[PDB]
């Protein structure tokens, strides 16, 4: 269970307890590499580095982000003060920009970053992309 500002899974502020990922291969512009899968993700994550600091809000082309079906945010990012928000993540595959979908949580944080709660993936090979733009 999570609330407006804290996640209880005891309760903590996601902006102060997340996993930091600096993985440029996650970029929506990276179409290379051996496809991997974010099946092992759990809890809250922050993305930094040249691959970008945010999930894409637009459908990503297949075979990007070092995966087969790249996953993007079927929603709009929250602002600081909006609390933890409920969103759908969509995987693009086989002509279908939401071939698979799963729930993700998003929170805006003091200091100008977002954190994402990512609980595995619905299929493999799927990954949560970052937009370097
Ligand atoms: C951070 O989150 C992890 C997993 O949710 C938990 O095991 C750990 O106790 C948390 N730490 C703090 C300080 O909240
Ligand atoms: C998700 O994407 C579809 C198609 O691109 C769009 O119609 C819908 O409004 C989007 N939902 C949100 C919450 O952004
Ligand atoms: C997010 O919203 C969906 C649709 O209302 C719901 O099924 C899901 O349980 C929500 N996630 C939560 C409350 O963590």
Numbering used by the authors: 41 to 49, 58 to 181
Paper text:
Glycoprotein 2 (GP2) and uromodulin (UMOD) filaments protect against gastrointestinal and urinary tract infections by acting as decoys for bacterial fimbrial lectin FimH. The structure rationalizes UMOD mutations associated with kidney diseases and visualizes a key epitope implicated in cast nephropathy.
To address these questions, we first expressed in mammalian cells the whole GP2 branch as well as the corresponding region of UMOD and assessed their ability to selectively capture the lectin domain of FimH (FimHL) from an Escherichia coli periplasmic extract. This showed that, as in the case of UMOD, the branch of GP2 is sufficient for interaction with FimHL. We then obtained crystals of the GP2 branch, but experimental phasing of its 1.9-Å-resolution data was hindered by relatively high diffraction disorder in one direction and low crystal symmetry. The electron density maps reveal that the GP2 branch is a protein module (henceforth referred to as ‘decoy module’) that consists of a β-hairpin stabilized by a disulfide bond (Cx48-Cy59), packed against a globular ‘D10C’ domain with a new fold including two 310 helices, nine β-strands (βA–βI) and five intermolecular disulfides (C163-C8157, C285-C9172, C3107-C6145, C4113-C10177, C5138-C7146). Interestingly, although the GP2 branch also binds FimHL, its D10C domain cannot be glycosylated at the position corresponding to UMOD N275 (R165). In agreement with these considerations, introduction of an N65A mutation in the decoy module of GP2 impairs its interaction with FimHL and mass spectrometric analysis of the glycans attached to N65 detects the HexNAc2Hex5 oligomannose structure, indicating that UMOD and GP2 exploit a common molecular strategy to counteract bacterial adhesion. Because of 60% sequence identity to UMOD, the crystal structure of the latter immediately explains the effect of many substitutions affecting invariant positions. Remarkably, most of these mutations cluster within two structurally important regions of the decoy module, the β-hairpin/D10C domain groove and the disulfide bond-rich region at the opposite end of D10C.
